[PDB]
Amino acid sequence: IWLSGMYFHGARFSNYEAWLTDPTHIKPSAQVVWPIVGQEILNADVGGGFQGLQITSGFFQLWRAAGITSELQL
Amino acid sequence: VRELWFPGNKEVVPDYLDGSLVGDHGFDPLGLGSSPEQLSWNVHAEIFHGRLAMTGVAGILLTSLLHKGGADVPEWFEAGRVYLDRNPNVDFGALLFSTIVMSGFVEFKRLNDIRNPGSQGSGILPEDFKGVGGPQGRTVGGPYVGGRYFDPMGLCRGSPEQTLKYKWNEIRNGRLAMMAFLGFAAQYAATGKGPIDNLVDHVADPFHTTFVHNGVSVPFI
Amino acid sequence: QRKLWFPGVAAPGYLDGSMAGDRGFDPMGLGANPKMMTWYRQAELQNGRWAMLGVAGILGQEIINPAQWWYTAGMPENLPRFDSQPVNMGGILAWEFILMHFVEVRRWQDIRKKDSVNADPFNPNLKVPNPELGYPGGPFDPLGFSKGNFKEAQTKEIKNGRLAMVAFAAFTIQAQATGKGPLQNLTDHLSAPFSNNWTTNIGHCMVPTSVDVQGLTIPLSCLWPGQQM
Amino acid sequence: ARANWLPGSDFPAHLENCKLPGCYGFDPLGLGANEERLAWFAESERVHCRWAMLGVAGILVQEIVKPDVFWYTSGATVELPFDITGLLAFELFVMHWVESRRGYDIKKPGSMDQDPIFSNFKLPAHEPGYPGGIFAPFVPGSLEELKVKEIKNGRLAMLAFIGFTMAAQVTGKNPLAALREHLDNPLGTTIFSKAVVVPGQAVVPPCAIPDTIEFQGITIPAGCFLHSLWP
Amino acid sequence: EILATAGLIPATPEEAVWFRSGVIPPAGQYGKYWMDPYSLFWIEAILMNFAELKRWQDFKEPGSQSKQYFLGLEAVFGGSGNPAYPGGQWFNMLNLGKTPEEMKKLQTNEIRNGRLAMIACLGCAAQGVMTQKGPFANLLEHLADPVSNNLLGNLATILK
Amino acid sequence: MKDFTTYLSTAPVLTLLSVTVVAGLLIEINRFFPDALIAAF
Amino acid sequence: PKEIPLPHEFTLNPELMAQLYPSFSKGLAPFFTLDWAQYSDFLTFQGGLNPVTGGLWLTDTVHHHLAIAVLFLI
Numbered sequence A: 001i002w003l004s005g006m007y008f009h010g011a012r013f014s015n016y017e018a019w020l021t022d023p024t025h026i027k028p029s030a031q032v033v034w035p036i037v038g039q040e041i042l043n044a045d046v047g048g049g050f051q052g053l054q055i056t057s058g059f060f061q062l063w064r065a066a067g068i069t070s071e072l073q074l
Numbered sequence B: 001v002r003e004l005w006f007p008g009n010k011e012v013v014p015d016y017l018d019g020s021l022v023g024d025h026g027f028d029p030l031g032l033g034s035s036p037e038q039l040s041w042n043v044h045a046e047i048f049h050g051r052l053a054m055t056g057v058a059g060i061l062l063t064s065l066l067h068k069g070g071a072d073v074p075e076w077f078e079a080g081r082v083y084l085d086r087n088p089n090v091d092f093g094a095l096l097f098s099t100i101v102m103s104g105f106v107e108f109k110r111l112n113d114i115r116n117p118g119s120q121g122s123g124i125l126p127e128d129f130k131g132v133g134g135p136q137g138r139t140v141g142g143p144y145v146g147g148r149y150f151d152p153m154g155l156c157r158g159s160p161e162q163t164l165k166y167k168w169n170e171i172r173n174g175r176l177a178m179m180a181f182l183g184f185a186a187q188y189a190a191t192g193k194g195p196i197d198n199l200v201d202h203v204a205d206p207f208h209t210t211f212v213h214n215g216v217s218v219p220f221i
Numbered sequence C: 001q002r003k004l005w006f007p008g009v010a011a012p013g014y015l016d017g018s019m020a021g022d023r024g025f026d027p028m029g030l031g032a033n034p035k036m037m038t039w040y041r042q043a044e045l046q047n048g049r050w051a052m053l054g055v056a057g058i059l060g061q062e063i064i065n066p067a068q069w070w071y072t073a074g075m076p077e078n079l080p081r082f083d084s085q086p087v088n089m090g091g092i093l094a095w096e097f098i099l100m101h102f103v104e105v106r107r108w109q110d111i112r113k114k115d116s117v118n119a120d121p122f123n124p125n126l127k128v129p130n131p132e133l134g135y136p137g138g139p140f141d142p143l144g145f146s147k148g149n150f151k152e153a154q155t156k157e158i159k160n161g162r163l164a165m166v167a168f169a170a171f172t173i174q175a176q177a178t179g180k181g182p183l184q185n186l187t188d189h190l191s192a193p194f195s196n197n198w199t200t201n202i203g204h205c206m207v208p209t210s211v212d213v214q215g216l217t218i219p220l221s222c223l224w225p226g227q228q229m
Numbered sequence D: 001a002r003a004n005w006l007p008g009s010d011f012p013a014h015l016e017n018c019k020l021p022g023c024y025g026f027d028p029l030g031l032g033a034n035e036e037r038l039a040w041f042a043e044s045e046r047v048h049c050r051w052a053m054l055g056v057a058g059i060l061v062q063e064i065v066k067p068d069v070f071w072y073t074s075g076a077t078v079e080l081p082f083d084i085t086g087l088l089a090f091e092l093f094v095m096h097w098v099e100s101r102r103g104y105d106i107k108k109p110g111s112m113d114q115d116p117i118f119s120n121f122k123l124p125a126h127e128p129g130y131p132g133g134i135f136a137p138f139v140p141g142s143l144e145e146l147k148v149k150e151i152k153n154g155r156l157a158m159l160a161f162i163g164f165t166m167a168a169q170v171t172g173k174n175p176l177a178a179l180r181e182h183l184d185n186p187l188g189t190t191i192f193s194k195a196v197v198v199p200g201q202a203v204v205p206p207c208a209i210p211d212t213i214e215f216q217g218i219t220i221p222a223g224c225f226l227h228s229l230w231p
Numbered sequence E: 001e002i003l004a005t006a007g008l009i010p011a012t013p014e015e016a017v018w019f020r021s022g023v024i025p026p027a028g029q030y031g032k033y034w035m036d037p038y039s040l041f042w043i044e045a046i047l048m049n050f051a052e053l054k055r056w057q058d059f060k061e062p063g064s065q066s067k068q069y070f071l072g073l074e075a076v077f078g079g080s081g082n083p084a085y086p087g088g089q090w091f092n093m094l095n096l097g098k099t100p101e102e103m104k105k106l107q108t109n110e111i112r113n114g115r116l117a118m119i120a121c122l123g124c125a126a127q128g129v130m131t132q133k134g135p136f137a138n139l140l141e142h143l144a145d146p147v148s149n150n151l152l153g154n155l156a157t158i159l160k
Numbered sequence F: 001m002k003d004f005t006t007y008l009s010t011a012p013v014l015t016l017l018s019v020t021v022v023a024g025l026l027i028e029i030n031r032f033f034p035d036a037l038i039a040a041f
Numbered sequence G: 001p002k003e004i005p006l007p008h009e010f011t012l013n014p015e016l017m018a019q020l021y022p023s024f025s026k027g028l029a030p031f032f033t034l035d036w037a038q039y040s041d042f043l044t045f046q047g048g049l050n051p052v053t054g055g056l057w058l059t060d061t062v063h064h065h066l067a068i069a070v071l072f073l074i
């Protein structure tokens, strides 16, 4: 279930597709927060026209090594 | 004994479903009516849902037929918006409040009847609103309310065989109408057209007009 | 019974052999129910008699009017004219619907309760003596071809009806696959059987997708998904 | 009895020993299963029979005497000697009085049998739905056969009125006019000749009645009875 | 493939292969059916659901499947002691194998033929993946040159 | 069904459901009425 | 990334995969003939890291997984 959640978040709330085109400047992000009490500030400008929390789990690198490329595969 | 929702397999048939209830086929794999009071509540909910679904489906079908003929009758998925547009003097909140209040009055009458089977057949109401019972061996109240107002033609008054046949007709039609409303919602969400529209487009071209060609059920197709 | 449809098959218990044409068939068990067996027997008699009339009519019209194809003999432009009245398929359907409805309701009522509608609605004295279901007799048997061995004649009728049903299915498939009449198909096969058989004709639907009947479009289709000519 | 709506069938249990006139055992839905409901429906059927007979006779006579006036639109094209409002009010008042008396007589047999103005006059004892006395000063034959005749003629009149309204909505002509039109071409004037539905196409005859009619200063709907449901 | 190789059907031998009928769209598909394969699978799922579920219920309860009404067909669903051999009025129309010894012999024939067919199906799948052709084509090519056309000779080209 | 409803009535299940309902209500109150520093009536 | 062929186009097409790795034009024949050296293009033992991505050579990882798989199976 945890793995499914990781893949789903990387496929719907991430910038993996944009990160593939620029993996050295775009910071990986796979979490988006809702705007409720000013917490939307946590949605950093990671890059590629995306806003979210910077992740450090290394899932983007793993997926790239596996040749995921697209979000449909995730 | 009686026909089951799955020929053979008496293990899946629950013990509380002995066949006395109308429309009983031993269907309850999840055991949602294991408790007696829960079973009674579910019986009331099922008959109410069937009647409501039949009324809604009949209205939707008639409005769709009128819309196809050229009448100024909008579709079911847009009837509310259309009516609100042609009547700009009717506040939406006011209509919602009025609907909730009137429905609350009748629903509270029915609710008190559910709590006390024969408590609404007096006071500001005649004995006709007391109910005839049926489920769980009850002889008063329940979803089957006889009288001269909820049964003016007296179809359930006289010959128990006719009453049983009509009760089975009602429950079967209610279940069919519930499934029909579910299909209406799914078809509208997949194709974006009404029921009659889908039926005529399918009859005109049987193959190439199935759920696989709507682009929603089968995403890659 | 004695001889069955297949060598060594076990005839079902309910197929004793009393009924005409009983060859111990019924591999689906549709006759295990007595009431359903009676209804199916009535349906078999009706289908066999109608198939006999249809096959005889198709063959007769092909012999007398070979220029007209039985498959398309129903279009309004091919309907023979006997008077100056206009051609209206709806009007013709009205007569047939009313008369057929009346006669079929009478037969149905007889099936429900035997000898219940055996009397004339106007003259109670005039009665139809039907010894069994599907065999009214009386006015329906003016020549009196019964009286004698009734079971033998019944067997002949049921066998002829079954043969006619098979023949009608054959006529339909042959017309949809070749676009000709049964006699025409038989003649063509006798000329070049190696090149005019079911192997070459099958897979072709020689019938248009739809037909225009005085404005009304009737969707047409073969009995099997052919190549649409 | 031997007179059955379906020869060879069996009369329903509630319709057995049925003493009502014109009782041929027709009740597939069992609407007459209840005894009280059966009597109420009998009174309703008798009143419908008489009203339909009067209406059909009036429509036929109006068409014969005045063939240039459409019975369907006669409500708004006749030129009333009085006013529509006053006429409707007067009719409603008198109809309320007579209908209330009749309905109460059905609910309670001898409750509405005395003259309120002249105490000396009183309707003699009778059966529900058949007043008699001053209402039947001439009876040519036995009452039972005449009752059967009345019920049968009333049923035929109801069917005739429905046919009249449907023919007026489909053809826009009067009863005899539609009959003459059908006689000039029987194979082309039937409902099967104008309407037909098939899996893929449907032919629906156009409405011969205007969508709306203008009466006085307002507009009245008056269209077609479920045109979208027409074949 | 055999009928197409002889020209009996209007399909080329390379188009009549079993893995190109539409079962695997990537490997090829026949787009001339009366309706698309997905809807065909929908009908297939409903029909097979009915048949397989009734068979399973009979396996669980041998006496069932012949009690509930099923358009009159339930009269031939009584089965027998062995779930694999119902052979009633329909499953054993011709009444073949009247004696127990004859039935045992026929059952042995059925088991041996089925095992050979299982092995053959697996072989057909493997050959199709490694030769990209049909079973009949593989057999003919092997007959033409057996020393060259075989498993060892086809190792160089497996998906070409 | 009775046992299931009894399990749903246990202290942990009821505590989590009550906390979730209260948190959801507060979140929606702050979503529709945000930045409520004082009780301005 | 949107221009690279899909994974199945590489898994079931030895021609394209051969265009990327020429040793694949020989199929599985070298593996069964004990001439594994032919597979040295995609089964390397380089070392270090890929100068473009900064990670280990995927060919080296493939060779590593194959070797450990044989060892574990034995």
Ligand code: CLA
Pocket (backbone or CB within 6 Å): B005, B017, B021, B022, B023, B024, B025, B026, B027, B028, B031, B032, B033, B034, B039, B042, B043, B044, B045, B046, B049, B175, B176, B178, B179
């Ligand atoms: C909300 C409508 C509703 C309700 C309240 C009931 C209630 C009842 N049904 Mg019934 N049924 C329904 C709809 C409903 N049914 C429909 C539409 C059909 C046609 C498929 C049937 C067919 C049916 C049969 C054949 C039988 C019953 C029977 C029963 C009784 C025993 C079952 C039980 O106790 O579980 C109670 C049921 C519920 C509490 C409903 C739970 C709904 C779940 C939680 C949601 C999931 C539904 C669906 C799979 C997801 C779609 C939702 C989404 C797409 C929006 C009971 C009183 C049995 C009986 O003895 O009759 C008296 C029986 O034999 N039902």
Ligand code: CLA
Pocket (backbone or CB within 6 Å): E084, E085, E086, E087, E088, E091, E092, E093, E094, E096, E097, E103, E106, E107, E108, E109, E110, E111, E113, E114
């Ligand atoms: C060569 C393979 C083979 C063999 C030897 C058998 C043998 C047997 N089967 Mg079996 N069967 C097979 C294939 C085979 N089957 C396949 C592929 C299926 C899947 C459809 C079945 C499904 C099946 C069922 C469901 C049942 C049997 C039963 C039986 C037993 C009954 C006796 C019998 O009919 O003999 C078999 C005779 C032959 C194999 C010779 C026929 C060979 C030709 C080519 C077949 C032509 C059939 C054709 C469609 C005929 C159509 C018209 C026809 C009705 C006149 C018997 C031991 C029944 C049983 O268990 O009895 C208690 C039973 O219940 N079979």
Ligand SMILES: CC(/C=C/C=C(C)/C=C/[C@@]12O[C@]1(C)C[C@@H](O)CC2(C)C)=C\C=C\C=C(C)\C=C\C=C(C)\C=C\[C@@]12O[C@]1(C)C[C@@H](O)CC2(C)C
Pocket (backbone or CB within 6 Å): B027, B028, B029, B030, B031, B032, B049, B050, B052, B053, B055, B056, B057, B059, B060, B075, B076, B077, B078, B079, B080, B177, B178, B179, B181, B182
């Ligand atoms: C009430 C209902 C529909 C009513 C619709 C109405 C009023 C529509 C109203 C309007 O349209 C009009 C007229 C006009 C429009 O302009 C506006 C709206 C307002 C839209 C459908 C219910 C629909 C209800 C449905 C479909 C219920 C299905 C339940 C099922 C199948 C449950 C099965 C089982 O529960 C059992 C029985 C046993 C368990 O153990 C196992 C499982 C399997 C869980």
Ligand SMILES: CC1=C[C@H](O)CC(C)(C)[C@H]1/C=C/C(C)=C/C=C/C(C)=C/C=C/C=C(C)/C=C/C=C(C)/C=C/C1=C(C)C[C@H](O)CC1(C)C
Pocket (backbone or CB within 6 Å): C025, C026, C027, C028, C029, C030, C046, C047, C048, C050, C051, C052, C053, C054, C055, C057, C058, C069, C070, C071, C073, C074, C165, C166, C168, C169
């Ligand atoms: C026995 C059994 C039992 C088991 O158990 C099971 C099973 C197997 C199911 C079984 C079997 C069955 C079968 C075989 C069936 C079949 C049938 C048929 C064929 C019918 C037809 C049937 C047929 C028919 C009626 C037909 C008829 C016909 C007709 C009228 C015709 C008409 C016509 C004509 C004149 C001419 C013109 O121009 C055209 C038309 C119009 C066209």
Ligand SMILES: CC1=C[C@H](O)CC(C)(C)[C@H]1/C=C/C(C)=C/C=C/C(C)=C/C=C/C=C(C)/C=C/C=C(C)/C=C/C1=C(C)C[C@H](O)CC1(C)C
Pocket (backbone or CB within 6 Å): D026, D027, D028, D029, D030, D031, D048, D049, D051, D052, D053, D054, D055, D056, D058, D059, D062, D071, D074, D075, D158, D159, D161, D162
């Ligand atoms: C019995 C039963 C039982 C079972 O069980 C079931 C079922 C089936 C349901 C059933 C049946 C039913 C039915 C059929 C019904 C119907 C009825 C009708 C038709 C009525 C009418 C009815 C009808 C009617 C009254 C009518 C009337 C009419 C009228 C008055 C008219 C009038 C008029 C005139 C003069 C003239 C002017 O200018 C116009 C007007 C004004 C218009």
Ligand SMILES: CC1=C[C@H](O)CC(C)(C)[C@H]1/C=C/C(C)=C/C=C/C(C)=C/C=C/C=C(C)/C=C/C=C(C)/C=C/C1=C(C)C[C@H](O)CC1(C)C
Pocket (backbone or CB within 6 Å): E090, E091, E092, E093, E094, E095, E096, E113, E114, E116, E117, E119, E120, E121, E123, E124, E127, E134, E135, E136, E138, E139
């Ligand atoms: C049940 C019943 C009962 C009643 O009563 C009677 C009756 C009717 C008789 C019945 C039925 C029966 C049946 C169905 C039968 C069928 C069978 C079959 C189909 C077999 C096959 C069977 C089949 C089989 C073995 C098959 C085999 C195969 C093979 C070897 C193959 C081989 C191969 C391969 C690998 C590949 C290569 O590249 C080529 C080749 C060389 C070609």
Ligand SMILES: Oc1cc(O)cc(O)c1
Pocket (backbone or CB within 6 Å): B152, D040, D103
């Ligand atoms: O709907 C009604 C029934 C009844 O018996 C009397 C009445 O006046 C109205």
